[PDB]
């Protein structure tokens, strides 16, 4: 408090508050969760409609970095767009220098070191974003990663980013995710969103579900949930 | 120019000659072609004389910088890596032909370096203009794991074969013996060529030259 | 950033300078140097600092720096800042000789330094030089010369000058006793030892606390004589003899 | 060639306690002389000289660049320069123009500043040092100067016979050359004094 | 005293102190971690615990043992983001030694070059001085095994028994009482004191699955991370 | 980066430089040292105690060679010392690449002090917190110099830097003389380091380097144990 101005200064007890201040700016964003089954990764983002003039699919938070890699950002949306273009550019140089797809364990290291560099100098500020990284391969399986604004990056089986970070992972861990298929996961992700405050004190919302795994043959794309609409049909039955 | 090296059962014997020419005129009758690198590594030079001199002093300055910062004895493979990486950058413009030899913890090591940057680890090498003559002496009479005086006799024989070929020397066969503990360096090891005596009277007279103007300036 | 910067460049509301006036006062709390013209020479005098008995003094010169071939300079102020100016000033006088093959004529050497010393008071946020220093030399056009460098960059050609807040009473003494026209070497050396008798408060003028260098145009050579400590002794006793005449009037 | 554009001949020779150096006086373009007072020997401190020969541009250029570095050396250090130290200084200056080289070949002759020990050396156009014990030569008429010095040189010579040997070596060799001549100046130095003499040569 | 901006940037205070670097000495202590290194023999042992608070959090992506080269391993304490960026320099400049000089880097030479990078961040301003700590091990031929330790201030040393993290002052006091009768360190005397120091400073007497053990030995000079089965073999071996 | 480029040092209204005087306080609170110029050599000694019984002694050295006839010690803070050591190594080789001759000890201090000058005037960096003692026997006579973090230098007969330096300054004045031998000079160099040492002095508590005319040489603990073996 006071010395908390620059990102290159220490507190008298030994922490940087400018990193601490940017972490709870991610806290005010809506909840985006991630989960992986035994043969794929399923994303899911609670996204709220601003007033009415939103045109049903604008400014999405499910990006597409590589052929098999996408993001699940939450926080400052404009800061995540510039950070997503770094990961698009980083995966292109690995293709041009080595001739094959980027491993997700190596991709998250290159991004987190880039986020780390904005937490050291007084000229720039730390980012205000946190996001997810999910991929699938036949020699590596499915992985799911997690990057904070400080730059700590390691793997989970399931996660949540937003207001309800604790309130979502309470009921994620009561799932037998080690053996389910990622078609049964999709109807289970939608009830985790709709339990915790979809439109209670808010106005409206719309669910987005991204999708990667064995059924897509390594491709990353949005669900065909528009087809048969089964996520909302199965989750709205949990009213009682 | 004829330089050669060999690896015997305990160390490395180097040999060179003592002539530098300009055109087809003998410029120097006593030139040193064995250069200091480290207290265990020496290097013989061949090719352009000023290119070999300014190269062998730079790398010897870097190894003195390296080993004093490290705190232990240098390695011959370190001096091998510095030379071939420098000479490759100049694209063969610097004309330097080097024979690198020394004794490390891992043992003796002998190399031959070409001015484009190609290096070869060999038990015996020859470089220079008379390298064709000295190499025929090796292949006829080399055997592995020789003794001390047996290896010294082979090199002084092989250098002398190039001396009695053209671009030989005013004749002071040089030897540098590098062992695990003892280090030798012999400039007048063999003088096979002598200058004959002058049989004529050349009495310069005190005043046989006309002087137009004299000038005296004392000092202190 | 912005809150970490020093000023070094900003005028007063009345118009004076904030940092330049400070550097011109630290030189007064330093050593003492002076010079004096002659009809056939010029000399310099200096005060020894740190006269502790565990030093070597193997340089044969500390305040004096023989700079080109026929010029030298005393020094005053920050000694750590002073070595930068001397290595530059020898290098200015030497690139002139590469350019014209004639020695530098003792004025535009000084203006070459005084433009460098000025430029840190202007553009760039940097610390100015806290060094004032003297000048002696000889040229083809005017002869024997003295000059007076300043941290501001001003220079003046003096006949007899000194340092201020350390020895400002010497300037009042030099206006009383330096007579114009005849100022020869034996008259100028006896005048110089009289001045340092009062300013240096050490009694009897111990010869290890002084330093004298001269310059004479001699047979087309312009020697620079840093005279040794053996002949400082009899130069003091000549002034010590003058007390015996000074008590005859009473 | 480029070396044969102005001519020149510089010879140094070692004696017992003394050393001598000599050069020619002719300045000129390829076949046309200009003047007979072109300086080719330059003093670099007391009891230590240097001689230059080759292209007349680089003779006047390097002698000013070396004087630029010598005066900065003799002020950072109160001592004078050793004759081994100057040879390393000149070889640094020529090697910096490795591919833009100066067209001259310097000859350094002088005594030790502490002892009486003489020193002679010569360098190439790119800076190869070469010390000897009898003589060094440089210039266009080099092969004629080897023929005179190999037959007339004696090991231990007084300054009388050393002057007479370097006189007959310079006169008989330069008169065989076409683009060199028009006067020979000889410097002979020792511990006590420096003697400069000019010789009576053919002016054709 | 607080003179000028001594409490904010890297300048001298009165009495010659400087606070922005000795604030980084307890920037390690927010990790909640303790690492112990022991050299006794022709071997060298790292031991460090893991702290897994979540069942959604993975197990393989928690490890602080980092493999620099095949013969050099290290452990990192302090904050996680500065730790992994420090290792990226250590992996990089260990390979520049092999390229420039043609042989394997000594463990003594590498700890110099890492501490020289932490020098400039103390020397220059507006550059944050990397609040983390590194401990090295490795085998030097004709010198035996070594253990080194680097500071954020740029200070390094080599010593036989090492503590780091939070509890240095209790563990180093235990090891001086341990290493005063220089008994026969026989590669299981080394591992047992590496456990019984940490099992009494923390005072846990813990399950076989909360620590890692890095090892190097004169026989097999490769860096080697122990398996959960053989970690359990040494743990029940000290049950007397 | 931005390119800020502003120095952190300006004048006081009294006319003193504040941050340089603060850096000498960190020098005076360092490990003590002593250096004595004898009639045939220069003796350096220092105080090397570990904070624990765990710290190895064959890892970090205090007496450090620069060339084979030049050594260099310090009194101040640890990690700032190794910067100017590596700076002085690369600087001393550049004299040898030009002149083909080892550097005299006077000429080395002309340039090392210019490096310590440059961090006092330039932008945003802080001055050193290490003073030095530089030794060497070049051209017959040996030399012993001392450089401060301000950028100046001196030429001592016998001096002492570190803690309790005002006590060692009076003790060297009451013990040294015009000439000694080098073997007598080490005896009065430990007795001035025994003034401020702890209760025990072994072969690993002190660390001594010498300068004969044969070159620079730092001493192994075999000699230092045999030297303090009951000869004071």
From Swiss-Prot, chain A:
Protein's UniProt keywords contain Cell cycle: no
Modified residues (N6-acetyllysine): 52, 201, 225
Residues recorded as bearing Phosphoserine in the entry: 238
Gene3D superfamilies: Glutamine Phosphoribosylpyrophosphate, subunit 1, domain 1 (3.60.20.10)
One of the record's GO cellular component terms: nucleus
Keyword Transcription: no
Matching InterPro entries: Ntn_hydrolases_N, Proteasome_alpha, Proteasome_alpha-type, Proteasome_asu_N, Proteasome_sua/b
SUPFAM superfamilies hit by this protein: N-terminal nucleophile aminohydrolases (Ntn hydrolases) (SSF56235)
GO terms under biological process: proteasome-mediated ubiquitin-dependent protein catabolic process
Compartment(s) where it occurs, according to its Swiss-Prot or TrEMBL record: Cytoplasm; Nucleus
Family, as annotated: Belongs to the peptidase T1A family.
Function comment: Component of the 20S core proteasome complex involved in the proteolytic degradation of most intracellular proteins. This complex plays numerous essential roles within the cell by associating with different regulatory particles. Associated with two 19S regulatory particles, forms the 26S proteasome and thus participates in the ATP-dependent degradation of ubiquitinated proteins.
Official protein name in the record: Proteasome subunit alpha type-3
Organism: Homo sapiens (Human)
Organism taxonomic ancestry: Eukaryota, Metazoa, Chordata, Craniata, Vertebrata
From Swiss-Prot, chain C:
NCBIfam families associated with the record: PRK03996.1
GO CC terms of this entry: cytoplasm; cytosol; extracellular exosome; intracellular membrane-bounded organelle; nucleoplasm; nucleus; P-body; proteasome complex
Localization per Swiss-Prot or TrEMBL: Cytoplasm; Nucleus
Quaternary context: The 26S proteasome consists of a 20S proteasome core and two 19S regulatory subunits. The 20S proteasome core is a barrel-shaped complex made of 28 subunits that are arranged in four stacked rings. The two outer rings are each formed by seven alpha subunits, and the two inner rings are formed by seven beta subunits. The proteolytic activity is exerted by three beta-subunits PSMB5, PSMB6 and PSMB7.
Cited function: Component of the 20S core proteasome complex involved in the proteolytic degradation of most intracellular proteins. This complex plays numerous essential roles within the cell by associating with different regulatory particles. Associated with two 19S regulatory particles, forms the 26S proteasome and thus participates in the ATP-dependent degradation of ubiquitinated proteins.
Protein name in UniProt: Proteasome subunit alpha type-4
Modified residues (N6-acetyllysine): 126, 175
Family the UniProt entry places it in: Belongs to the peptidase T1A family.
Residue intervals passing through the bilayer: none
Any Pfam family the entry gives: Proteasome_A_N
Gene3D superfamilies assigned: Glutamine Phosphoribosylpyrophosphate, subunit 1, domain 1
Keywords: Acetylation, Cytoplasm, Host-virus interaction, Nucleus, Phosphoprotein, Proteasome
Keyword Cytoplasm: yes
Protein's GO biological process: proteasome-mediated ubiquitin-dependent protein catabolic process
Gene this chain is encoded by: PSMA4
Swiss-Prot record, chain D:
GO cellular component, one term: proteasome core complex, beta-subunit complex
N-acetylserine, modified sites: 1
A matching Pfam family: Proteasome
Classification via PROSITE patterns: PROTEASOME_BETA_1, PROTEASOME_BETA_2
GO BP annotations listed: proteasome-mediated ubiquitin-dependent protein catabolic process
Source organism superkingdom: Eukaryota
Predominant location category: cytoplasm
Stimuli inducing this protein: Up-regulated in asthenozoospermic sperm.
Disulfide cysteine pairs (residue numbers): none
Family indicated by similarity: Belongs to the peptidase T1B family.
Role according to the record: Non-catalytic component of the 20S core proteasome complex involved in the proteolytic degradation of most intracellular proteins. This complex plays numerous essential roles within the cell by associating with different regulatory particles. Associated with two 19S regulatory particles, forms the 26S proteasome and thus participates in the ATP-dependent degradation of ubiquitinated proteins.
Subunit architecture: The 26S proteasome consists of a 20S proteasome core and two 19S regulatory subunits. The 20S proteasome core is a barrel-shaped complex made of 28 subunits that are arranged in four stacked rings. The two outer rings are each formed by seven alpha subunits, and the two inner rings are formed by seven beta subunits. The proteolytic activity is exerted by three beta-subunits PSMB5, PSMB6 and PSMB7.
Protein name: Proteasome subunit beta type-3
Organism: Homo sapiens (Human)
Curated annotation (Swiss-Prot), chain F:
GO cellular component: cytoplasm; cytosol; extracellular exosome; extracellular region; ficolin-1-rich granule lumen; nucleoplasm; nucleus; P-body
Gene Ontology process terms (BP): proteasome-mediated ubiquitin-dependent protein catabolic process; response to virus
Localization of this protein: Cytoplasm; Nucleus
UniProt keyword list: Acetylation, Cytoplasm, Nucleus, Phosphoprotein, Proteasome
Induction: Down-regulated by antioxidants BO-653 and probucol. Down-regulated in response to enterovirus 71 (EV71) infection (at protein level).
A Pfam entry, by short name: Proteasome_A_N
Modification Phosphotyrosine occurs at: 4, 22, 74, 119
PTM per Swiss-Prot/TrEMBL: Phosphorylated on tyrosine residues; which may be important for nuclear import.
InterPro entries xref list: Ntn_hydrolases_N, Proteasome_alpha, Proteasome_alpha-type, Proteasome_asu_N, Proteasome_sua/b
Positions of modified residues (N6-acetyllysine): 68, 169
Entry-annotated residues carrying Phosphoserine: 5, 12, 14
Major site of localization recorded for this protein: cytoplasm
PANTHER family documented for this protein: PROTEASOME SUBUNIT ALPHA/BETA (PTHR11599)
Self-association and partners: The 26S proteasome consists of a 20S proteasome core and two 19S regulatory subunits. The 20S proteasome core is a barrel-shaped complex made of 28 subunits that are arranged in four stacked rings. The two outer rings are each formed by seven alpha subunits, and the two inner rings are formed by seven beta subunits. The proteolytic activity is exerted by three beta-subunits PSMB5, PSMB6 and PSMB7.
Family: Belongs to the peptidase T1A family.
Protein name: Proteasome subunit alpha type-2
Organism: Homo sapiens (Human)
């Amino acid at each position: 408090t006071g010395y908390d101005l620059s990102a290159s200064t220490f507190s008298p007890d030994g922490r940087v508050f400018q990193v601490e201040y940017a972490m709870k700016a991610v806290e005010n964003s809506s909840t985006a969760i991630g989960i992986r089954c035994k043969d794929g990764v399923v994303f899911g983002v609670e996204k709220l409609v601003l007033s009415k003039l939103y045109e049903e699919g604008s400014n999405k938070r499910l990006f597409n970095v590589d052929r098999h890699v996408g993001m699940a950002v939450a926080g400052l949306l404009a800061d995540a767009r510039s950070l997503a273009d770094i990961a698009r550019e980083e995966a292109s140089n690995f293709r041009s220098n080595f001739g094959y797809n980027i491993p997700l364990k190596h991709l998250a290291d290159r991004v987190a070191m880039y986020v780390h560099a904005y937490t050291l100098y007084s000229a720039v500020r730390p980012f205000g974003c946190s996001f997810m990284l999910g991929s699938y391969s036949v020699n590596d399986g499915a992985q799911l990663y997690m990057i904070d604004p400080s730059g700590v990056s390691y793997g989970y089986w399931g996660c949540a980013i937003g207001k309800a970070r604790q309130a979502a992972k309470t009921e994620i861990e009561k799932l037998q995710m080690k053996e389910m298929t990622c078609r049964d996961i999709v109807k289970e992700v939608a009830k985790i969103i709709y339990i915790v405050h979809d439109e209670v004190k808010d106005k409206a919302f719309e669910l987005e579900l991204s999708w990667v795994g064995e059924l897509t043959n390594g491709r990353h794309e949005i669900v065909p949930k528009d087809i048969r609409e089964e996520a909302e049909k199965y989750a709205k039955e949990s009213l009682k | 120019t004829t330089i050669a090296g060999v690896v015997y059962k305990d160390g490395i014997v180097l040999g060179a000659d003592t002539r530098a020419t300009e055109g087809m005129v003998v410029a120097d009758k006593n030139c040193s072609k064995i250069h200091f690198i480290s207290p265990n590594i020496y290097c013989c030079g061949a090719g352009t004389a000023a290119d070999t001199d300014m190269t062998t002093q730079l790398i010897s300055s870097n190894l003195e910088l390296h080993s004093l910062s490290t705190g232990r004895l240098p390695r011959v493979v370190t001096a091998n890596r510095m030379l071939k990486q420098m000479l490759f950058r100049y694209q063969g413009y610097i004309g330097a032909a080097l024979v690198l030899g020394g004794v490390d913890v891992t043992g003796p090591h002998l190399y031959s370096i070409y001015p484009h940057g190609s290096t070869d680890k060999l038990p015996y090498v020859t470089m220079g203009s008379g390298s064709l003559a000295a190499m025929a002496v090796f292949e006829d009479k080399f055997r592995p794991d020789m003794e001390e005086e047996e290896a010294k006799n082979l090199v002084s024989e092989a250098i002398a074969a190039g001396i009695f070929n053209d671009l030989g020397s005013g004749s002071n066969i040089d030897l540098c013996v590098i062992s695990k503990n003892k280090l030798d360096f012999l400039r007048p090891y063999t003088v096979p060529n002598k200058k004959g005596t002058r049989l004529g009277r050349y009495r310069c007279e005190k005043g046989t030259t006309a002087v137009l103007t004299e000038k005296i300036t004392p000092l202190e | 950033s912005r809150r970490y910067d020093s000023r070094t460049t900003i005028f007063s509301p009345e118009g004076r300078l904030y940092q330049v006036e400070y550097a011109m006062e630290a030189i007064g709390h330093a050593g003492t140097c002076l010079g004096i013209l002659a009809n056939d020479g010029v000399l310099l005098a200096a005060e020894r600092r740190n006269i502790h008995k565990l030093l070597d003094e193997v340089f044969f010169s500390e305040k004096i720096y023989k700079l080109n071939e026929d010029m030298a300079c005393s020094v005053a102020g920050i000694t750590s800042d002073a070595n930068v100016l001397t290595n530059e000033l020898r290098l200015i006088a030497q690139r002139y000789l590469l350019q014209y093959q004639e020695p530098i004529p003792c004025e535009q050497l000084v203006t070459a330094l005084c433009d460098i010393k000025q430029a840190y008071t202007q553009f760039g946020g940097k610390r100015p030089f806290g060094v004032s220093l003297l000048y002696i030399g000889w040229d083809k056009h005017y002869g024997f010369q003295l000059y007076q460098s300043d941290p501001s960059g001003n220079y003046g050609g003096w006949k007899a000058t000194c340092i201020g807040n350390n020895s400002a009473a010497a300037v009042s003494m030099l206006k009383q006793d330096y007579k114009e026209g005849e100022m020869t070497l034996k008259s100028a050396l006896a005048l110089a030892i009289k001045v340092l008798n009062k300013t240096m408060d050490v009694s009897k003028l111990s010869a290890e606390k002084v330093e004298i260098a001269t310059l004479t145009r001699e047979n087309g050579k312009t020697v620079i004589r840093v005279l040794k400590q053996k002949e400082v002794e009899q130069l003091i006793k000549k002034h010590e003899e003058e007390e015996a005449k000074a008590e005859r009037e009473k | 060639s480029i070396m044969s554009y102005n001519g020149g001949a510089v010879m140094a020779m070692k004696g017992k306690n003394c050393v001598a150096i000599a050069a020619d006086r002719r300045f000129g373009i390829q076949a046309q002389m200009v003047t007979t007072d072109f300086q080719k020997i330059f003093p670099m401190g007391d009891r230590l000289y240097i001689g230059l020969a080759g292209l007349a541009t680089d003779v006047q250029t390097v002698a000013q660049r070396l004087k630029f570095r010598l005066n900065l050396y003799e002020l950072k250090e109160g001592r004078q320069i050793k004759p081994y130290t100057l040879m390393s200084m000149v070889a640094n200056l020529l090697y910096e123009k490795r591919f833009g080289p100066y067209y001259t070949e310097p000859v350094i002759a002088g005594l030790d500043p502490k002892t009486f020990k003489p020193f002679i050396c010569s360098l190439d156009l790119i800076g190869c040092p070469m010390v000897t014990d009898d003589f060094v030569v440089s210039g266009t008429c080099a092969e004629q100067m080897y023929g005179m010095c190999e037959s007339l040189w004696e090991p231990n010579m007084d300054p009388d016979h050393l002057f007479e040997t370097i006189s007959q070596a310079m006169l008989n060799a330069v008169d065989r050359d076409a683009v060199s001549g028009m006067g020979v100046i000889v410097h002979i130095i020792e511990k006590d004094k420096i003697t400069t003499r000019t010789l009576k040569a053919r002016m054709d | 005293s607080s003179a000028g901006f001594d409490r904010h940037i890297t300048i001298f205070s009165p009495e010659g102190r400087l606070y922005q670097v000795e604030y980084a000495f307890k920037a390690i202590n927010q990790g909640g971690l303790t690492s112990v290194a022991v050299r006794g023999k022709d071997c060298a042992v790292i031991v460090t615990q893991k702290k897994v608070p979540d069942k959604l959090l993975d197990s393989s992506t928690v490890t602080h043992l980092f493999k620099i080269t095949e013969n050099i391993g290290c452990v990192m304490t302090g904050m996680t983001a500065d730790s992994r960026s420090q290792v990226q320099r250590a992996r990089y400049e260990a390979a520049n030694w092999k390229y420039k000089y043609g042989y394997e880097i000594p463990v003594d030479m590498l700890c110099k070059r890492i501490a020289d990078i932490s020098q400039v961040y103390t020397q220059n301003a507006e550059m944050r001085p990397l609040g983390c700590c590194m401990i090295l091990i490795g085998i030097d031929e004709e010198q035996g095994p070594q253990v080194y330790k680097c500071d954020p201030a740029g200070y390094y040393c080599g010593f036989k028994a090492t503590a780091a993290g939070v509890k240095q002052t209790e563990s180093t006091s235990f090891l001086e009482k341990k290493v005063k009768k220089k008994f026969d360190w026989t590669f299981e005397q080394t591992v047992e004191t590496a456990i019984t120091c940490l099992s009494t400073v923390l005072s846990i007497d813990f399950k076989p699955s909360e620590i890692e053990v890095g090892v190097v030995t004169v026989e097999n000079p490769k860096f080697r991370i122990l398996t959960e089965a053989e970690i359990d073999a040494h743990l029940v071996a000290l049950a007397e | 980066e931005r390119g800020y480029s502003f120095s952190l040092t300006t004048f006081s209204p009294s006319g003193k430089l504040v941050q340089i005087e603060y850096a000498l306080a960190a020098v005076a609170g360092g490990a003590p040292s002593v250096g004595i110029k004898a009639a045939n050599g220069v003796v350096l000694a220092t105080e090397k105690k570990q904070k624990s019984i765990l710290y190895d002694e064959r890892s970090v050295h205090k007496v450090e060679p620069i060339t084979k006839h030049i050594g260099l010690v310090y009194s101040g803070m640890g990690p700032d010392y190794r910067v100017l050591v590596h700076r002085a190594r690369k600087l001393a080789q550049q004299y040898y690449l030009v002149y083909q001759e080892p550097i005299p000890t006077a000429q080395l201090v002309q340039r090392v002090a210019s490096v310590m000058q440059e961090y006092t005037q330039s932008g945003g960096v802080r001055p050193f917190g290490v003073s030095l003692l530089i030794c060497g026997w070049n051209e017959g006579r040996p030399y012993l110099f001392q450089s401060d973090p301000s950028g100046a230098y001196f030429a001592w007969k016998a001096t002492a830097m570190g803690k309790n330096y005002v006590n060692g300054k009076t003790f060297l004045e009451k013990r040294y003389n015009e000439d000694l031998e080098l073997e007598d000079a080490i005896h009065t160099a430990i007795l001035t380091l025994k003034e401020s040492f702890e209760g025990q002095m072994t072969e690993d508590n002190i660390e001594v380097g010498i300068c004969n005319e044969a070159g620079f040489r730092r001493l192994t603990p075999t000699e230092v144990k045999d030297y303090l073996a009951a000869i004071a």
